[PDB]
Amino acid sequence: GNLNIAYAKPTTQSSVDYNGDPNRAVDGNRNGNFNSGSVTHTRADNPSWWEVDLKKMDKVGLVKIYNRTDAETQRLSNFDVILYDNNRNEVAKKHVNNLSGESVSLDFKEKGARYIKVKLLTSGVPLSLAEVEVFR
């Protein structure tokens, strides 16, 4: 029941495989079954990454990242979540080793940012996200 400022914002990612376009992580659908059409998928890049562009700077609090759930859930491990300002200067970064459940929640404590990037640190692994939600 809070405004998800990432919903329907422009997205990009390192590449696309299996028609897993990056907008699937901001489609309002948390379903993690890749066959549902809700989940992104890159090729096995060096490294794989995904990003949302808020279009303007905003003050970011909670970021909630929902994993793929039907298969290959371990791929979302050893990754950074990085905030960038309007000139793509790095303003904050958190590292996530792995998920114990279907999602992870990170609190960036009001940091001003335009872009939120999720980046695997292990190359040669596709990045698949069910949904990334971003709150003020």
Ligand SMILES: CC(=O)N[C@@H]1[C@@H](O[C@@H]2O[C@@H](C)[C@@H](O)[C@@H](O)[C@@H]2O)[C@H](O[C@@H]2O[C@H](CO)[C@H](O)[C@H](O)[C@H]2O[C@@H]2O[C@@H](C)[C@@H](O)[C@@H](O)[C@@H]2O)[C@@H](CO)O[C@H]1O
């Ligand atoms: C259109 C089509 O047939 N799609 C296939 C993928 O198969 C479908 O998606 C899977 C996730 C399963 O639900 C499957 O039952 C369904 O048909 C196929 O994925 C692989 O499917 C095999 C079974 O045939 C295994 O389940 C394997 O784990 C699946 O691969 C994982 O999911 C993929 C989407 C990629 O992320 C892979 O890297 C994973 O290992 C793929 C790959 O053969 O091919 C599509 O064309």
Ligand SMILES: [Ca+2]
């Ligand atoms: Ca989705």
